[PDB]
Amino acid sequence: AQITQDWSVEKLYAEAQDELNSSNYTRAVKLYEILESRFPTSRHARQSQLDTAYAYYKDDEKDKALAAIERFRRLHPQHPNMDYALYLRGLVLFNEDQSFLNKLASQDWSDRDPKANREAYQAFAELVQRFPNSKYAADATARMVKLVDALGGNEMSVARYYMKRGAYIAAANRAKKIIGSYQNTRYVEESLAILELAYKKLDKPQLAADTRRVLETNFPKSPFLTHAWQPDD
Amino acid sequence: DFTIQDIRVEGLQRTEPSTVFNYLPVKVGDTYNDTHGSAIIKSLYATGFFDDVRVETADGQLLLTVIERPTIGSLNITGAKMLQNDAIKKNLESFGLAQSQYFNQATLNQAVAGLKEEYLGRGKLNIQITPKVTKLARNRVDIDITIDEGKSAKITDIEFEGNQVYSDRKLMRQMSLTEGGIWTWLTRSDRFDRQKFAQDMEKVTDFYQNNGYFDFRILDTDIQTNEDKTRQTIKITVHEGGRFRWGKVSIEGDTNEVPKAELEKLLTMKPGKWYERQQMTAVLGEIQNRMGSAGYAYSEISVQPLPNAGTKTVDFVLHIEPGRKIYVNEIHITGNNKTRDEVVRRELRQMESAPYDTSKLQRSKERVELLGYFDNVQFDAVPLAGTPDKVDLNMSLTERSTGSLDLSAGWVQDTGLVMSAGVSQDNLFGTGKSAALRASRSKTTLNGSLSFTDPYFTADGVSLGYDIYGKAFDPRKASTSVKQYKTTTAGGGVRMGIPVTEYDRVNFGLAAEHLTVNTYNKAPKRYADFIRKYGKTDGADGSFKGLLYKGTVGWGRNKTDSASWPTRGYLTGVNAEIALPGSKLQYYSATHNQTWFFPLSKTFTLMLGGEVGIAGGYGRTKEIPFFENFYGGGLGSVRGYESGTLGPKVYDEYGEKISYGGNKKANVSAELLFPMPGAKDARTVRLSLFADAGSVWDGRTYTAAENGNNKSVYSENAHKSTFTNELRYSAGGAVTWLSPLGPMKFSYAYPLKKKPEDEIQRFQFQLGTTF
């Protein structure tokens, strides 16, 4: 509180959005909270608590934005823009990692953590369950299948590394978990091959024959069928 | 019955009647007689909405005359002296009081109570807390914090009751609390703290317990203030139990898989020394680590003392009750951002689906913390809903940045300014793949280098990498006129590390290098022979260009408890610079390393150091090139004479003194470390005193020179630079300033058995790294 100048809410919104264009947020949120303190009854309060969340999404802290959006839920649980806030949550929880110093355009995204990925999956499930028809339906399902593919790929990388060490008795349970609760993924016809190789290396002839029958009935054409599975790299 | 038709609340400002429509447990068209007359009160009183709501029922428009919760707009912060205003602001935000945060007076009372009690925990007792509550705009409130702090809380006398077994003074010398004197005024080293007092209490418990006195019945503690609440006095009353003789420990219990004989052997104890309770805790720890490495994490060990008086002894029966052998089902990892999952799974033991052994878990913990990528790591063990033999080992990390650019400067006694710049990275936004560009430059040294390493080449691990360096050195510089020659080396090298065991890791290396060494104006005798045998003369100068294909063997172990401020442990190793044949200048040199430590006292620590190395000649080259010889004497070598001033000294044109150096170096060191008790234990300075000899030898004898011999004896046997078992006596003290801006070592040395040819250096100062 250093200028404390009377202004117009529309001009304040214009200044805040052009500051967002020019990456000025610390004063924008301070230009946001002042209008809410002086003029409480305004949708600009919600617009502020959402675009300062987007700003903290460009920045590092998250607890402030999450606390603000939960306080909003506690005060105004019936605003129509809630979905966007929800999306913003799914945004701020996803951790796009906007940083050019370590760009790495590949960015497999399967290295952040299982915690945030699983929490974003739960959040997006709550999203699709709450509003079946919002301003965003295709992008939500797209990023959802992307993150579940990333989780499956993380599990696949764990299983692959464990196979590089010889833990067949452990890769067995890992592959069982993958084949039992990680369907519809792309890392299927390779994990099955690792399970078959492990069963062959563990002297399980009947189990190997059975799992190979499942192989030929579930994947009739795959390069892993001709060439036995070999740990890459 | 009653049907609700748009029940109105009146006496509001911003409550948004739709929001309260949602919040009331009823809605439009609902019957309410008296049910939620107080339930709504509890709901809106919770979640921070209102504090005084009058609920009425009249004409369908209920008069809810509410005084809205005041808003903490801007917290006024001042009067904080020892603690920071941002700190109190953050730890108050921890309790709420965020933006407008529906302020409550009871929360203010709770906060002021918390701060006053936490300050009473400190040396501030008489706190006139006056948080000024002022009515700002419509609902804004500013809470002003005012802490009227006392001077301090120092102790006048520290005495106990029944103080017959030990002297008061020596008892004060062991506790972590002193009284006011001349070495306590600075840094307020006499403040009183609750946690520090409890720590001193448990410390004196361990003191009386290790000495052989049992059960240490502490009667009471009495604190007393003075007038105006400025000074503090402490009184203690305790009770001892006398010494004993504990010799009959025993163990009993089921040992399904581990043999009892092993547990009895690990139970190190004897009827002598009458006991050691620290050893009791140690044997509990070792029996929990061993019995529990077979796969029994929940081994509960019970201990009950059996005291037999008259003879004044106590025995210890250990009724261990293990069972339900624990396997491992799965192990997760959390907080692994910016890092691959495999770079963490590649280090720890306890693969999977195996019995759970803490012996491997602690090794995995030390291995992962030895990586440096993370700050804090924990090893949780949560059971699963399939609790027979199935548990879970979810992980947790605290990430730390790895790559950075270093731009450091340092100052040495003779050369002066030295610079070291460069970029380094331990994780190139992927796996480890550590690489670094580093260039150091002084008035006499130039060292550029690019390096790139990968700890894991194979599946287990090989430190595979490349490196191209730009070594250059020329000491023809200011007053210190070391033998004049400019050398510059470059080229590459394969350096392969290979762990032989879980602890140690040897590393070999081959390298193809090019070298250009150019001398200067007319050189001593040992240079013309080289430039006419292998080098190339050019008028009154000499130069040489070629290849120096060389290898390096290394093996170094270090187990000190801390990098800085060392303790029990020892840095040792072996190294070998063997210029592999195939190119010119076929030579080799070996070295050793031994820096044993000994903390034989709580304050004074000693060290037994010493290194040994030989630089042999082989193949075509029979002599030793000067530009790769050793320079005896210096700071780290003898802590005495000037650097590179050992060995013989030969006169050159215009009467300058040059030293050749030998092919057999050795040194042994010994000092005594104790800190300075002036202000406090601030980690800034360390004092010691060394008394160490040297070693430098030539083997041949020197009689011919530039018409003048710099030695007393006309035929001084240069087999040793001195009498047999080459060495030079000296000693002296050494202070070290260990501020984070590099070490500043100031050594004041006095020579011993001073021969009339050894130039002395009484005071040496080194600032920074100067590596």
Side-chain angles (χ1 to χ4, degrees), chain A residues 1-134 136-233, chain B residues 1-26 28-139 141-190 192-228 230-482 484-601 603-689 691-696 698-718 720-761 763-771:
Chain A
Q2 299 296 325
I3 185 66
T4 71
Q5 198 52 242
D6 194 2
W7 276 324
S8 159
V9 284
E10 306 91 355
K11 182 195 56 48
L12 292 180
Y13 175 70
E15 176 63 29
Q17 69 190 109
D18 59 52
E19 280 159 330
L20 170 140
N21 303 137
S22 45
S23 65
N24 173 261
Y25 304 103
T26 316
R27 274 195 177 180
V29 59
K30 262 47 154 179
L31 285 180
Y32 280 153
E33 60 90 21
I34 186 167
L35 72 94
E36 311 146 5
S37 159
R38 295 177 181 175
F39 294 153
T41 311
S42 314
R43 303 163 211 167
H44 277 86
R46 286 162 283 273
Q47 305 157 12
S48 66
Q49 65 189 354
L50 66 85
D51 52 13
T52 192
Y54 185 33
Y56 301 151
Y57 190 59
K58 275 90 72 180
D59 201 74
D60 73 327
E61 71 265 11
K62 273 84 70 177
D63 290 331
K64 173 141 52 153
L66 305 183
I69 64 186
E70 296 320 298
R71 189 182 299 170
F72 156 69
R73 295 182 64 184
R74 192 166 60 209
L75 306 163
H76 317 107
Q78 297 302 112
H79 196 257
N81 212 12
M82 174 68 199
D83 48 355
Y84 183 68
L86 289 165
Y87 187 68
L88 281 195
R89 176 177 165 99
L91 287 202
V92 306
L93 205 170
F94 169 78
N95 278 321
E96 185 86 19
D97 193 329
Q98 183 65 40
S99 159
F100 199 66
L101 60 88
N102 53 328
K103 182 252 290 180
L104 189 61
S106 44
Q107 212 65 26
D108 205 274
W109 278 346
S110 45
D111 42 353
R112 324 293 205 93
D113 53 350
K115 175 74 170 172
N117 288 10
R118 183 193 278 101
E119 195 38 69
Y121 172 73
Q122 180 67 41
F124 288 141
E126 181 45 58
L127 257 65
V128 59
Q129 214 286 315
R130 180 62 70 98
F131 290 157
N133 50 3
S134 66
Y136 58 103
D139 60 346
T141 46
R143 64 182 63 250
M144 196 151 48
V145 307
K146 284 298 290 294
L147 60 89
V148 303
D149 280 311
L151 168 79
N154 182 25
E155 292 292 329
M156 164 56 54
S157 54
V158 187
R160 265 204 302 259
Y161 161 71
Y162 282 170
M163 184 42 57
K164 177 53 50 172
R165 308 305 307 277
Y168 306 145
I169 61 162
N173 304 65
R174 187 66 80 174
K176 297 321 182 152
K177 169 82 143 200
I178 303 148
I179 67 155
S181 86
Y182 277 73
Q183 288 82 12
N184 318 106
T185 63
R186 66 173 300 188
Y187 308 98
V188 191
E189 40 188 352
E190 40 266 51
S191 44
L192 310 177
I194 305 147
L195 179 75
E196 206 287 327
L197 191 52
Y199 273 163
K200 292 205 308 319
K201 285 253 186 177
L202 283 193
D203 305 67
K204 298 193 179 302
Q206 303 88 359
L207 268 298
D210 295 335
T211 190
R212 187 163 158 267
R213 196 182 319 168
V214 190
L215 290 171
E216 60 97 8
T217 57
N218 262 23
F219 283 106
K221 290 189 61 59
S222 178
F224 302 130
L225 267 298
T226 69
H227 289 169
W229 195 86
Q230 192 69 40
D232 197 0
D233 308 72
Chain B
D1 202 312
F2 170 64
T3 297
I4 277 168
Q5 292 98 16
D6 185 57
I7 284 295
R8 306 287 324 144
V9 284
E10 301 296 333
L12 60 89
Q13 293 173 334
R14 55 153 271 193
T15 76
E16 272 198 29
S18 87
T19 56
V20 67
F21 279 149
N22 200 338
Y23 263 103
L24 310 171
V26 305
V28 69
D30 200 89
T31 295
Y32 152 69
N33 45 4
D34 71 325
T35 300
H36 55 53
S38 315
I40 311 178
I41 309 299
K42 299 171 177 181
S43 49
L44 61 88
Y45 273 8
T47 78
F49 287 164
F50 310 105
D51 69 326
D52 198 321
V53 291
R54 290 312 94 211
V55 58
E56 316 306 306
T57 318
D59 192 73
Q61 312 209 344
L62 315 190
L63 274 298
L64 270 295
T65 79
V66 54
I67 43 184
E68 286 187 348
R69 297 284 289 274
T71 76
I72 180 65
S74 69
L75 185 67
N76 290 345
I77 49 177
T78 188
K81 317 299 277 188
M82 63 171 71
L83 176 142
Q84 302 89 350
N85 271 325
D86 61 357
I88 190 59
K89 188 165 56 181
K90 294 317 289 173
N91 59 53
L92 187 49
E93 291 322 298
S94 67
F95 289 159
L97 304 193
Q99 278 318 295
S100 169
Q101 198 65 41
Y102 299 87
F103 165 79
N104 177 21
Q105 189 78 38
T107 58
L108 185 148
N109 303 116
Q110 204 279 318
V112 301
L115 61 91
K116 69 171 46 57
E117 68 91 22
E118 83 188 69
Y119 273 17
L120 264 291
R122 322 296 173 87
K124 297 319 153 65
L125 73 163
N126 52 4
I127 299 308
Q128 264 283 334
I129 173 63
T130 79
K132 188 150 183 162
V133 189
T134 43
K135 184 66 177 67
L136 265 74
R138 293 86 51 202
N139 273 291
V141 186
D142 280 19
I143 299 315
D144 193 340
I145 55 182
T146 53
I147 309 298
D148 286 333
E149 297 181 355
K151 193 43 203 182
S152 159
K154 73 155 158 296
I155 179 59
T156 71
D157 50 353
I158 318 182
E159 71 275 17
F160 314 111
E161 291 299 85
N163 220 319
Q164 193 265 326
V165 62
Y166 275 76
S167 87
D168 296 330
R169 175 73 169 276
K170 194 163 66 66
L171 268 173
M172 301 315 109
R173 298 315 281 265
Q174 215 274 346
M175 54 170 54
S176 159
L177 279 172
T178 187
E179 315 180 356
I182 201 55
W183 56 74
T184 54
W185 289 2
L186 305 160
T187 71
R188 56 180 61 249
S189 315
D190 206 0
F192 169 61
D193 181 17
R194 317 287 306 279
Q195 285 77 10
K196 194 164 196 297
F197 191 84
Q199 289 184 28
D200 206 320
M201 294 311 105
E202 56 89 29
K203 266 197 54 60
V204 307
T205 72
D206 307 294
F207 187 45
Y208 281 168
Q209 203 172 3
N210 286 297
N211 296 329
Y213 294 89
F214 197 35
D215 293 325
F216 189 23
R217 294 296 181 186
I218 300 110
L219 269 74
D220 204 2
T221 294
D222 180 28
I223 64 184
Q224 295 289 326
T225 190
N226 65 341
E227 71 291 330
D228 313 278
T230 44
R231 301 281 85 82
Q232 186 80 4
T233 76
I234 306 304
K235 183 86 202 74
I236 317 290
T237 170
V238 289
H239 188 271
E240 311 94 295
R243 82 170 186 88
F244 296 89
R245 288 200 164 166
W246 296 359
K248 315 296 298 180
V249 72
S250 159
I251 50 154
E252 278 184 352
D254 198 0
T255 56
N256 311 272
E257 201 206 1
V258 173
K260 321 172 187 178
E262 181 179 357
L263 312 178
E264 300 148 2
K265 290 165 193 175
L266 270 296
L267 189 54
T268 174
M269 203 53 238
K270 60 193 301 296
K273 309 217 166 169
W274 309 333
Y275 199 71
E276 180 166 357
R277 287 84 160 164
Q278 188 268 336
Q279 183 196 359
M280 148 60 68
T281 60
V283 306
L284 302 195
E286 74 84 20
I287 201 67
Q288 206 87 340
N289 287 36
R290 184 59 195 81
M291 176 57 255
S293 62
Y296 293 87
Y298 295 152
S299 296
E300 307 320 315
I301 171 165
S302 72
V303 62
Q304 42 164 12
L306 184 139
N308 178 294
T311 183
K312 308 309 289 176
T313 189
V314 191
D315 305 331
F316 281 137
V317 71
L318 278 300
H319 184 48
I320 178 61
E321 197 87 354
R324 305 306 307 156
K325 174 177 285 294
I326 288 98
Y327 301 147
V328 308
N329 194 0
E330 206 55 53
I331 183 165
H332 307 151
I333 292 173
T334 58
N336 43 297
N337 193 23
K338 190 67 182 294
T339 59
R340 278 293 156 88
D341 192 328
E342 194 182 333
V343 70
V344 186
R345 296 288 174 97
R346 217 151 54 242
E347 276 287 82
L348 82 163
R349 299 308 188 270
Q350 179 45 283
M351 192 69 200
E352 200 60 84
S353 47
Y356 169 82
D357 45 352
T358 65
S359 45
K360 272 186 194 161
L361 206 67
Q362 202 269 341
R363 174 57 195 168
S364 64
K365 190 223 287 186
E366 79 201 50
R367 180 75 142 275
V368 63
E369 66 195 278
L370 186 45
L371 192 59
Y373 284 177
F374 320 116
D375 285 329
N376 192 359
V377 70
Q378 305 91 317
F379 273 82
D380 186 277
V382 61
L384 167 58
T387 181
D389 315 279
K390 303 303 187 63
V391 200
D392 314 298
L393 280 299
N394 54 5
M395 183 64 42
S396 54
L397 277 303
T398 68
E399 300 159 43
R400 173 170 58 95
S401 87
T402 81
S404 198
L405 82 170
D406 55 356
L407 277 59
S408 158
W411 197 271
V412 72
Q413 184 175 49
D414 54 357
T415 317
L417 73 162
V418 295
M419 285 75 74
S420 45
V423 58
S424 44
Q425 177 52 264
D426 313 277
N427 186 300
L428 176 135
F429 45 85
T431 78
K433 299 222 175 304
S434 199
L437 263 288
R438 150 171 185 80
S440 66
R441 188 172 186 261
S442 69
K443 204 173 181 57
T444 182
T445 80
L446 263 69
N447 264 346
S449 290
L450 60 89
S451 65
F452 150 75
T453 44
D454 196 339
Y456 301 86
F457 186 54
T458 187
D460 209 316
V462 188
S463 64
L464 180 137
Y466 321 121
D467 43 356
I468 307 307
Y469 61 93
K471 185 281 180 174
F473 177 79
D474 189 10
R476 169 57 166 279
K477 290 312 298 175
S479 87
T480 61
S481 315
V482 172
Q484 303 85 19
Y485 57 95
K486 51 190 214 171
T487 62
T488 179
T489 300
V494 58
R495 39 192 309 268
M496 286 306 90
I498 181 168
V500 62
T501 186
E502 60 158 355
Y503 281 179
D504 268 7
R505 184 174 185 167
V506 76
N507 46 5
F508 314 139
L510 312 95
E513 311 297 335
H514 182 280
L515 171 52
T516 313
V517 52
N518 190 0
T519 65
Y520 283 159
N521 191 260
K522 50 189 72 59
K525 160 75 158 51
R526 194 180 178 182
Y527 286 28
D529 47 2
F530 161 76
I531 70 183
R532 69 189 148 103
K533 278 304 288 284
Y534 303 106
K536 198 262 191 203
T537 183
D538 301 301
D541 200 350
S543 315
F544 178 90
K545 302 168 51 183
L547 300 157
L548 273 294
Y549 296 172
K550 67 169 74 175
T552 45
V553 194
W555 162 78
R557 58 186 305 167
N558 177 16
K559 61 176 55 54
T560 178
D561 313 331
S562 87
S564 300
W565 297 77
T567 42
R568 146 84 188 189
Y570 56 95
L571 288 76
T572 57
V574 296
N575 282 322
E577 175 61 272
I578 183 154
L580 65 89
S583 177
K584 274 81 71 176
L585 309 97
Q586 208 284 333
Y587 64 90
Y588 74 97
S589 159
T591 57
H592 210 276
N593 190 304
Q594 261 159 3
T595 43
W596 275 344
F597 284 90
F598 277 111
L600 263 294
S601 158
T603 300
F604 313 134
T605 65
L606 65 89
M607 70 151 66
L608 315 179
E611 286 78 41
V612 173
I614 298 92
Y618 211 76
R620 181 198 307 182
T621 42
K622 182 61 67 181
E623 306 319 298
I624 287 297
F626 54 89
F627 37 86
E628 60 92 20
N629 198 319
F630 280 89
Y631 291 156
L635 176 63
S637 75
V638 300
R639 210 77 57 94
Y641 301 159
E642 295 90 318
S643 279
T645 50
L646 265 187
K649 269 293 165 175
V650 178
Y651 281 166
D652 195 358
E653 196 195 27
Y654 308 119
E656 273 78 5
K657 305 195 276 184
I658 295 305
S659 195
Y660 289 162
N663 54 5
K664 43 184 69 64
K665 311 291 108 175
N667 63 326
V668 283
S669 45
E671 52 81 32
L672 58 97
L673 166 80
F674 63 104
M676 185 262 286
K680 64 167 191 304
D681 278 27
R683 296 313 155 100
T684 192
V685 285
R686 288 159 53 101
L687 174 47
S688 279
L689 61 94
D692 315 315
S695 177
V696 49
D698 194 4
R700 273 176 303 184
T701 177
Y702 281 163
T703 310
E706 198 77 13
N707 302 122
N709 277 323
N710 313 348
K711 313 298 280 294
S712 87
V713 179
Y714 171 76
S715 315
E716 187 268 331
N717 58 277
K720 313 308 172 63
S721 67
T722 181
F723 290 87
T724 186
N725 294 37
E726 61 276 50
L727 71 88
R728 300 292 210 187
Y729 297 103
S730 312
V735 306
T736 53
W737 189 357
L738 202 58
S739 87
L741 273 299
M744 297 69 89
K745 308 181 74 76
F746 306 151
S747 67
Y748 182 65
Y750 182 72
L752 311 162
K753 202 53 183 175
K754 185 259 289 181
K755 306 307 288 296
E757 60 271 16
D758 305 68
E759 289 75 20
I760 69 178
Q761 176 55 261
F763 166 75
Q764 309 149 341
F765 82 92
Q766 172 267 347
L767 325 177
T769 69
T770 78
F771 285 162

